[PDB]
Amino acid sequence: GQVDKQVSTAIENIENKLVASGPGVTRYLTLPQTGWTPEQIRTELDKLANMEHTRWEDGRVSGAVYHGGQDLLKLQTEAFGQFGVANPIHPDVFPGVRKMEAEVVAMVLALFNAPSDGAGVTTSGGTESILMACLAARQKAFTERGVKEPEIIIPDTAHAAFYKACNYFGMKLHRVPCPAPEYKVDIAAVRRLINPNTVLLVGSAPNFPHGIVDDIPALSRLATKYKIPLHVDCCLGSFVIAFLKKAGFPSPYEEEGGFDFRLPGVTSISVDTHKYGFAPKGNSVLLYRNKTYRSYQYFIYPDWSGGVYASPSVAGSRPGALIAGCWASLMSVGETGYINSCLEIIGAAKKFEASIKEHPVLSKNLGIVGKPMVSVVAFQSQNGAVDIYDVADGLSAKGWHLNALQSPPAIHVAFTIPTAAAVEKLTTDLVETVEKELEKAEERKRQGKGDTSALYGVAGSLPDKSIVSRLAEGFLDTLYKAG
Amino acid sequence: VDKQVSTAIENIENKLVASGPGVTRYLTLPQTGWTPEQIRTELDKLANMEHTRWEDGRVSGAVYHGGQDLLKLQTEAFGQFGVANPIHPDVFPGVRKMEAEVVAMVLALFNAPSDGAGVTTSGGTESILMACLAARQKAFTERGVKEPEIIIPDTAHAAFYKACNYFGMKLHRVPCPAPEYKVDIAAVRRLINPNTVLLVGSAPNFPHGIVDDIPALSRLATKYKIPLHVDCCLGSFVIAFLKKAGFPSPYEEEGGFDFRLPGVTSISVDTHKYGFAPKGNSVLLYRNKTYRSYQYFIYPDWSGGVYASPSVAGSRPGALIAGCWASLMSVGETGYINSCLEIIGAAKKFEASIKEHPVLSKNLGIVGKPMVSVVAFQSQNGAVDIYDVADGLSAKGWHLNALQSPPAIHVAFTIPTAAAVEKLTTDLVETVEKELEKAEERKRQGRGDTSALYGVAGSLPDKSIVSRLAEGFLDTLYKAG
């Protein structure tokens, strides 16, 4: 009962927090009987656009909007306008799109020093990329090594999409710890888990939670040695991780052959053109060391009454409009653009990182998680008087949308062109937030002795996960609740 | 074999990859960003590359509306919601709303129950995948099934195979025999076993545009307590508005083909076909939230925080969502009824033409009894090879769909193609006539046409051949240099 009531309450709170109601909220739950007018639609749409929301425009949201620049957005919009009806599955009908796509891939292959037989596909997103990589490896190991009970070895810090992959394609997952202070995968632990049913090694460049780049060289050595495909999740490093050297920022493992196709064990890399490529959402690229590989992810069904069906990825039908958007984005930004943006973003990251380490308050109370090199800075509490989640809620109350982590308890900022412009303000607000909690503790001690974010703390520590499970289930339901 | 293959592939590449003077191939990022005007210029160039003229209504079921007014609106929506990502509802509430509303509107269209739930997917493929996954997870959680099986009609969409391949399920193909080209209910029944986790039905099916016996499937589904999924991807809005338009509604008098039938647990609908939403916009419908839930992915233990996603994709395009939404609102019931009237009208007209026109009626035959937007016809004359007809129309600039079982061609009518039905009829007549003449000279004395090679390869003992051929195609799709 009680658990139930608590849950229901929590859900109700979520719904009350996400579902926007109140006078003015017209809920359109059935098709209009007569078509609205263009102006009508435009009006309503503006109305929607101006709903109250975390002001990403004010650079207060972590890694949600990477560029946001009107000029670019317009361009993307025009591209969309020109290729609105384009569907690449019909290259003979939409050749332009087909070209643009190919080119996008090419351009990315180059960024990561791909071999000449390098091949790649566009995917809707990093999730899809990862899925397809996994599938690829599975099919590979099946066709070649006749493997039937597939296994993949991932770091704990690895992106959940991998678990999704294993869940979907029926693979056994192995999570290796990334212990402090390095917060990098345990190579020995990886080695130990390698067995004949291992079909994929995974590495992160960097990883979502902490923004740490795993020991891709070491993983490559293992991969080469045991003849197992290495996949690099670079979704989040995107362009930024690549332009690091050009920007002058140290490139992860430069002196050990980098983190990309330069390393012979690296067989597949996933890159999100929509994160730091600044492409429209719905634009990622998966790279394979050779066509031979890529092929495993293809779906061909020749016996179909409707004709031979062939699809390179998950989707049959896709949006040429978005493809074109991605393309132009790349062309409009260009090497210079990316170097510049890199400079800014990484600069901001480094500045923040310094702030935490140096600022008299922060340096005493907080600590950086590992040694982040890219665009993601994760920090945790080094003072038992300051609960990190409390800090999170404190910043949230100040209008910040940062990312709360679990293992360990921490917060991360994924810096984007917007957030980079707000770094100082972030620093300020963080200082103030921290101070406040210190006073609270002081007041607690004075008194002798309400914690929010407990969902990630108390609930994070809760014995069963069923609780958080139901909580999320609600969230998701809410996402589609209109009535 | 190898040489033949390689040649074929080379022909494909030489037929899809535009080369030749002026074809600038950008294989690396420009060193300095291009200017807006430069980009616009290039983009126009790309847009005006030579291609099958869908604008002239010569492409089957690729562009459903294509109307400038709508496109502009969609474009504006995209412009306003370019950066929107629904996974952040607190950041992009509008999108979150619009989505929910879309789902609702569709749920209504198919007479969903009050506890009816639904998600948006990128497309019908994804819808189908998610339905299959849902069923699987259901049967696992509830009936502890470990070796899942699904029963589908032969005419069912390949995405089902993809689903089974992906999620490791056993697939059962049931025949759809002439003249009905509907699934064999008896054969379905016989295959039902404790490991059966999903029954499938088509409304209509892609190849022949036939609606399966959804009532019967519903009965079986209720009886054996197995989920029924209706693939409605291709019936989309048009099948929903058929009766309103005045055209007969499949199985009206037996409770229709949608949630009115108690056995119908899930329906997949493509807002991007006849909803006229931008590409990347489909909806999956479930009789109850409880059901829908099975397709959700929740990973709570993740160091980055509790991950939860409703479908395949984590990140998604709010721009597209908003576009789809507006499309609906801008078109409205009236609009859809009108478009239905036109499209179905055209289909029927074509169907009649084939049955009545002195030439065609003698040489061709409709496949089954189509009622929707897909009209499929085959050769009734051994002198006329359907694929040859296909190639003939192809030479006339038509992009129609060539089928295998049986050998046939289909037209999926869209606002464009509907406007060209007459011209299509004319060109078809002329095409047929030609092949008849050819056969005359043939018989008077005693080669290989492309489509024929497609048929020959499909008639070959092993599919490995065609497989490779397809692979090549796909590779081509990503060849830039």
Author numbering:
A (entry chain A): 85 to 533, 540 to 573
B (entry chain B): 87 to 532, 539 to 573
From the paper:
Deacylation of Cer to sphingosine and subsequent phosphorylation by sphingosine kinase lead to the formation of sphingosine-1-phosphate (S1P), whose irreversible degradation by S1P lyase (SPL) terminates sphingolipid metabolism. SPL (EC 4.1.2.27) is a pyridoxal 5′-phosphate (PLP)-dependent enzyme bound to the endoplasmic reticulum membrane through an N-terminal sequence, with the catalytic domain facing the cytosol. The protein is a tight dimer and belongs to the Fold Type I family. The active site is formed by residues from both subunits and comprises an Y-shaped channel whose distal part is largely hydrophobic.
To confirm the soundness of our virtual screening campaign, we solved the crystal structures of unbound hSPL and AfuSPL at 1.8 Å and 3.5 Å resolution, respectively. The structure of AfuSPL was solved at low resolution. Structural superposition with the human protein results in a RMSD of 0.82 Å (between 412 Cα pairs). Notably, the AfuSPL structure displays a structured N-terminal region, consisting of a long helix that is not observed in hSPL, although its presence in hSPL is predicted by AlfaFold50. This helix is positioned near the active site access cleft and, at least in the soluble construct, is much more flexible for the human protein compared to the fungal enzyme. Moreover, AfuSPL has an insertion of six residues in the C-terminal region that may also alter the dynamics of the substrate binding cleft. On the other hand, no significant differences are observed at the active site level, where all the residues likely involved in substrate binding are conserved. Finally, it must be noted that the position of the additional N-terminal helix that is observed in the AfuSPL structure suggests that the protein binds to the membrane with an orientation that places the active site entrance on the opposite side with respect to the membrane surface. In particular, the N-terminus helix, that is structured in AfuSPL and disordered in hSPL, partially covers the access to the binding poket and provides additional hydrophobic residues to stabilise the binding of lipophilic compounds, and this may account for the higher interaction of AfuSPL with ANS. A clear explanation to these data is not currently available, but we could speculate that this is due to either the structured N-terminal helix in AfuSPL, which could increase binding affinity by partly closing the cleft and preventing ligand dissociation, or to the increased flexibility of the regions allowing the access to the active site in AfuSPL, which could favour the adaptation of the ligands to the active site cleft.
